[PDB]
Design a protein around this ligand. Structure first.
Ligand SMILES: CNC(=O)c1n[nH]c2c1CCCC2
Length: 164
């Protein structure tokens, strides 16, 4: 069904996350964590306090798809177990910063060809696939985008609802 998913997304905020590679999304799916640059980290921490759910929608650059979406379960924190992210050649791991805990809502992919009818008012009404890492997606567009993903029958949203 879609009813618990709609409940989780009600009055949520949504952010596009762009990963340079599949490896970091695979790590995020295995470990329930994400890290971003400080500019986006500050935005996500503000949003986490502001809304009942903050949803990250992931897309690997050049893949032509989204790889799934997840809900922040924490603000960012330092000092945890290190994550061996793959970073650009010139970048150190400290340039990233804190680690957000996330609960996956859908680990399945959605090709950009399926979201061509959705535009993001917060990015000049460009197709929702277009945007920089951290771009906020307006509520209606983000909700409709999440509802386009194939159902992930491995997920039980019961425990996520209780965290809200
Ligand atoms: C795990 N997090 C990431 O791989 C990430 N998220 N945003 C950026 C990066 C690396 C490159 C700079 C911009």
């Amino acid at each position: 069904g879609t009813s618990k998913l709609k409940y989780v997304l009600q009055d949520a905020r949504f952010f596009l996350i762009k990963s340079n590679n599949h490896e970091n999304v695979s790590l995020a799916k295995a470990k329930g964590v994400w890290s971003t640059l400080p500019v986006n980290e500050k935005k996500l921490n503000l949003a986490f306090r502001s809304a009942r759910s903050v949803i990250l929608i992931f897309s690997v650059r050049e893949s032509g798809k989204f790889q799934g979406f997840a809900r922040l379960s924490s603000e960012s924190h330092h000092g945890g177990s290190p994550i061996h992210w793959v970073l650009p050649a010139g970048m150190s791991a400290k340039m990233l910063g804190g680690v957000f805990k996330i609960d996956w809502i859908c680990r399945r992919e959605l090709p950009f060809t399926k979201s061509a009818h959705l535009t993001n008012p917060w990015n000049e009404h460009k197709p929702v696939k277009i945007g920089r890492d951290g771009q906020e997606i307006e509520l209606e567009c983000g909700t409709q985008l999440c509802l386009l993903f194939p159902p992930d029958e491995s997920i039980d949203l019961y425990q996520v609802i209780h965290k809200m």
